[PDB]
Amino acid sequence: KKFLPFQQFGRDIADTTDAVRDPQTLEILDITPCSFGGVSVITPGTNTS
Amino acid sequence: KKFLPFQQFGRDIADTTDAVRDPQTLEILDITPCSFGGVSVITPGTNTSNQVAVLYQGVNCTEVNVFQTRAGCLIGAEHVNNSYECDIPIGAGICASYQTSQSIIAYTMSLGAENSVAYSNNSIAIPTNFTISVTTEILPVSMTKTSVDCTMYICGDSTECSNLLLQYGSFCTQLNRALTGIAVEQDKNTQEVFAQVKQIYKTPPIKDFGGFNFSQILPDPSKPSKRSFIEDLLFNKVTDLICA
Amino acid sequence: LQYGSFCTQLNRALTGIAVEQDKNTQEVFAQVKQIYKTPPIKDFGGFNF
Amino acid sequence: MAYRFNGIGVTQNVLYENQKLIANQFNSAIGKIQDSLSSTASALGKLQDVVNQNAQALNTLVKQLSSNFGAISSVLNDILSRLDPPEAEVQIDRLITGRLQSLQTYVTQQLIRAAEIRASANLAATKMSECVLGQSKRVDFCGKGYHLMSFPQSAPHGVVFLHVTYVPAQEKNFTTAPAICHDGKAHFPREGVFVSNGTHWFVTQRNFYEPQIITTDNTFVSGNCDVVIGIVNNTVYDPLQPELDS
Amino acid sequence: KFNGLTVLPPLLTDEMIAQYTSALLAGTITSGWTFGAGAALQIPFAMQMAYRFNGIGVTQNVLYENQKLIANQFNSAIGKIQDSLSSTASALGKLQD
Amino acid sequence: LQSLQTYVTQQLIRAAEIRASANLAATKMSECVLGQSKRVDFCGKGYHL
Secondary structure, three states, rough: OOOOOOOOEEOOOOOOEEEEOOOOOOOOOOOOOOOOOOOOOOOOOOOOO | OOOOOOOOOOOOOOOOOOEEOOOOOOOOEEEOOOOOOEEEEEEOOOOOOOOOOEEOOOOOOOOOOOOEOOHHHHHHHEEEOOOOOOOOOOOOEEEEEEOOOOEEEEEEEOOOOOOEEEOOOOOEEEEOOEEEEEEEEEOOOOOOOOOOOOOHHHHHOOOOHHHHHHOHHHHHHHHHHHHHHHHHHHHHHHHHOOOOOOOOOOOOOOOOOOOOOOOOOOOOOOOOOOOEHHHHHHHHOOOOOOOO | OOOOOOHHHHHHHHHHHHHHHHHHHHHHHHHOEEEOOOOOOOOOOOOOO | OHHHHHOOOOHHHHHHHHHHHHHHHHHHHHHHHHHHHHHOOOHHHHHHHHHHHHHHHHHHHHHHEEEEEEOOOOHHHHHHHHOHHHHHHHHHHHHHHHHHHHHHHHHHHHHHHHHHHHHHHHHHHHHHHHHHHOOOOOOOOOOOOEEEEEEEEEEEEEEEEEEEEEEEEEEEEEEOOOOOOOOEEEEEEEOEEEEOOOEEEEOOOOOOOOOOOOOOEEEOOOOOOOOOOEEEHHHOEEOHHHHHHH | OOOOOOOOOOOOHHHHHHHHHHHHHHHHHHOOOHHHHOOOOOOOOOHHHHHHHHHOOOOOOOHHHHHHHHHHHHHHHHHHHHHHHOOOOHHHHHOOO | OHHHHHHHHHHHHHHHHHHHHHHHHHEEEEEEEEOOOOOOOOOOOOOOO
């Protein structure tokens, strides 16, 4: 994504930051939130195995 | 109304005073709340025209082609005596529509064309011809499955914030099972409806229908996903958003 | 306003009710698109309607 | 389809003879459905309202995080880096309390919306067996007109049903009599109605007009001619009379 | 009431819903069961009750013979409906709830 | 705010009871009024006419 010269921080429909601009060396970076997905346990009955 | 000489202020069943007595002069003055109501905007779709008609509820015309109806003040519309099929529902048996140099008019909702049936001792009507019609009925079956996490949603990436959630007990743990139960019910609706049998029947290679063409409703193997010609239009006519 | 859309949402929920009630009126009372009327001479075969 | 017409009160003899004309009416009826769904996109609005119902509920729940809920700011990292841990808890209490009411409101709406979906699920499962799978004499459940056969169709987050109904169209003014008096005993129809065009009384079906000469096989003798009201006089053909010559 | 609670008027007036009833009542008398399944087809009411008995397993001959008796039982039954609804006001409690 | 939640919550629940009755009423007019119902005790005790 190409932000206008005067624009720095973008945001998505959810108002969270979509991308930022490094103030020292100017560049755009896409932030992908971490820690996604759950943990499910598939096991038969206790008396089975 | 006449208040008791020793009772200055009145009240209703809601404990709200509907009238008061002048502290100086002796009189009975009823307190009527100021005019208020909802603002209704009756206008055709942006594709048709930009004409708009404002409608007020439970109030006559005060602020303000200013016409009055049973539901309230209606401005920007024209009253027509001819009754037609309902278009835009309003109330009190009145519907609005955009027609003819065209504007918005207000007419009484019509119940349909009048049809008189002649009755007689020996009078009877036996159909001399028939017509086969196919009616379409659409009903919802499965609902979009959404599993929300009250641990991550309530406190994002916060250990201290999450610590306060433990004081609330099962509130988070309880809401997780409520949403999980809805996801399980979504699968039972498709199994008790879509598939009523335990076997899969396929059409024979040579199809003789006796003069009827089922190709529209029959599945097409040429497509990558097997579906009927009618199902193809349903998938396209029925619509990232989830990524956010 | 600090509490968010709760005000807006509580109005939409009740708005749906008012709409669904009008649906029950049409889906029940009116089973036909025409208005039927009897002739002036009424022969009911002994019944009084 | 021969038996399907017997359940609606129509003799199967009309299908074999008129099956040629039904091919043009049935095939043409299916074509109109494909053109209506493609050209008109408002017929599927029933299912679209279900998806949009959850969309507005998801965006609303996400927009609550932007609200302060009485707190100074709606961001957790902002309040944690400014106010003290004890002071932040006071503000965090309004954040969690405001979010809990928003989260419970979403779950409460889902349970209510889920109940409405289950109500339509039973109807969809009922139309499958009665309309599609079998044949039901109930009127206007499978669509207007006498029900014959139903063709199910898959649709996203729902199902579409194609129902075939039998709707009579053309009719004519006829003169009918409650009973026929011949030998002095009231003659009553076994099946059909008594219709006359002004010349001779006929016995025809209610749903279809098929003139047939009155005979002892299509009627049964009951009562007399002085009981039934509005009885008329006529002659009943007996197949045994002409066979006496052999 | 005065706190900002708005009572929205109904879409159809009590008169309109009454016209739908009159349409159904007038239809069943002249057209029997036909108007619901298709175009209106006039049938004599005497034959309507006749074919409604054949559907339940009763030969229509009973009607023509007992038509006079069925006329008194029915009319006497409708009279009890007016006396019941007029005398007993609790039968509508389902709506009062 | 909680008072409105309690009110809206009850109206939505009660609406389900009314909507369920509306569908029932629409079903009776079809089987009982418009046509002749062969179901047992759906139109009331005895064979329905």
